């Protein structure tokens, strides 16, 4: 049954990063894999992510959030980086596996 959808949608709203106008992927900690994935993003997707982040930091410093109508909706959250990130981690594991072989 659709129990996840119930839970995942609850958490999404509970988390609250959407109050800053940030996508889930905008909040990922930039470790090695993420850094590489970001380098693969297309120009526009990259510049868009940058604006959202710079804007959130501005909100953070002002101690405000966005007006409720601009909050990202659980079903409109774009997993723009997940595809790349997955390829990156796969590749890395391949190298790692091959370097023991």
């Amino acid at each position: 049954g659709r129990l996840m959808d119930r839970i995942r949608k609850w958490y999404y709203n509970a988390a609250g990063f959407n109050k800053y106008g940030l996508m889930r992927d905008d909040t990922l900690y930039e470790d090695d894999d993420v850094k590489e994935a970001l380098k693969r993003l297309p120009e526009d997707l990259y510049n868009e992510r940058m604006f959202r982040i710079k804007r959130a930091l501005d909100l953070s410093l002002k101690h405000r959030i966005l007006p409720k109508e601009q909050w990202v909706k659980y079903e409109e959250d774009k997993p723009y980086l997940e595809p790349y990130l997955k390829e990156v981690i796969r590749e890395r594991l391949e190298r790692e596996a091959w370097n023991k072989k």
Partner: protein, 421 residues
């Protein structure tokens, strides 16, 4: 069992398959293709150059990492040679690894992914690649030569122009491969393998549909003159005329006139006496120099003439002396014995060309690509010596009478213009 056959199937889609078993401990498979800067247009110039360097990028079957690691794992190699009109992707390796190495050769030529990032990263390499190539003045004037000789197709440079470095796109690379790497423009040649085997691989893995994809524009002759004044102590110059195309009885005539005039040295540090052109230029100047009969045969055209290299101050006399040797030859100044000797050097050269695996594989594939067949080393010799002294003198005339194109680089302060020859 050094009495094996040179089989050569030809699947329905038009893909030609030529193999040969010489029982050598090393196999050398290759994928010949009718592609090149010739099929580029103003809009996608250099895309063929980059495609050449893109061979190690990730494919649908193998990752960039595995392509390199895989081949190296078995002491194998992967390279890509190319001319203005043909591209060859070949791999070498010990017999027992032909399977391994094959997967990659396959993926590279038929399943490239040209990932945007990998492509962006690779483009600066074009500057580097081009930089080392251009260290030989030879390469620079030959580029200009083709740009003066033609107005289109063959006029395109073999190395990506500078303004386009970093501008080639993945779309462009994909479109190029889609419209040129078609089963009816490809040939899967192999050595140290068994035809039944090689034949099997083809029909089972080579996909990318048939057709002739986008056809290339006809080569239009121009007869221009490009002069690059760069101050070098040595002056390289090449003067040509539209010669015979690939597959022609006219070709053979020039090949011979070539060797009659002087086609490269045969003795180390030695003079070339059997060289009309060299000997003639030699009598004119006292300083170091070099003259040779230039000759290129392309699908729908060719170029013929002479290439010189001389000190700047003596460029004038050296180039004019090379010209007289051509007129003189056009005016019956060709012995019947000269034509005999040249025919030897020509038969010898061709015969030596095939000693090395690279040379053999290239001989087989080139023909097996431009006519899915294979001339016997006897028929080729038969065709060559059956070239009268008349033929040769005619070739020489076609040159003195035809419109010429010239290209020269260096301190051109004393280099004559095409209209003073």
């Amino acid at each position: 069992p050094g009495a094996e056959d040179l089989e050569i199937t030809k699947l329905p889609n038009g893909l030609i398959i030529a193999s040969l078993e010489n029982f050598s401990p090393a196999s050398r498979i290759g994928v010949f293709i009718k592609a090149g800067s010739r099929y580029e247009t103003t809009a996608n110039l250099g895309t063929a150059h980059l495609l050449r360097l893109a061979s190690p990028l990730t494919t649908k079957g193998a990752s960039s990492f595995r392509i390199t690691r895989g081949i190296e794992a078995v002491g194998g190699s992967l390279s890509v040679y190319s001319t203005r009109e043909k591209m060859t992707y070949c791999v070498e390796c010990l017999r027992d690894h032909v399977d391994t190495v094959m997967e990659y050769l396959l993926n590279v030529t038929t399943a490239p992914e040209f990932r945007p990032w990998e492509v962006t990263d690779l483009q600066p390499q074009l500057k580097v690649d081009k930089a080392v190539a251009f260290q030989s003045p030879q390469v620079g004037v030959l580029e200009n030569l083709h740009a003066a000789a033609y107005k289109t197709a063959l006029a395109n440079p073999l190395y990506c122009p500078d303004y386009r470095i970093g501008k080639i796109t993945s779309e462009q690379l994909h479109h190029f491969v889609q419209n040129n790497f078609t089963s009816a423009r490809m040939a899967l040649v192999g050595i140290g393998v068994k035809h039944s085997d090689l034949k099997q691989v083809a029909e089972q893995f080579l996909n990318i549909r048939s057709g002739a994809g986008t056809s290339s524009a006809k080569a239009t002759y121009w007869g221009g003159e490009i002069r690059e004044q760069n101050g070098h102590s040595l002056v390289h110059a090449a003067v040509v005329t539209e010669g015979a195309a690939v597959g022609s009885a006219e070709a053979n005539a020039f090949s011979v006139l070539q060797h009659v005039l002087g086609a490269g040295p045969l003795i180390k540090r030695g003079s070339s006496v059997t060289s009309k052109l060299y000997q003639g230029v030699a009598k004119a100047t006292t300083q170091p120099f070099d003259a040779s009969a230039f000759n290129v045969n392309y699908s729908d055209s060719g170029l013929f003439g002479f290439y010189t290299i001389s000190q700047a101050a003596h460029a004038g006399e050296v180039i004019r002396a090379a010209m007289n040797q051509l007129k003189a030859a056009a005016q019956g100044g060709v012995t019947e014995e000269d034509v005999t000797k040249a025919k030897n050097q020509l038969k010898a050269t061709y015969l030596m060309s095939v000693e090395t695996a690279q040379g053999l594989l290239n001989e087989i594939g080139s023909e097996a690509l431009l006519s899915g067949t294979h001339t016997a080393p006897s028929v080729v010799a038969q065709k060559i010596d059956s070239v009268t002294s008349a033929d040769v003198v005619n070739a020489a005339k076609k040159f003195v009478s035809g419109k010429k194109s010239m290209a020269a680089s260096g301190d051109l302060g004393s280099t004559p213009f095409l209209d003073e020859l």
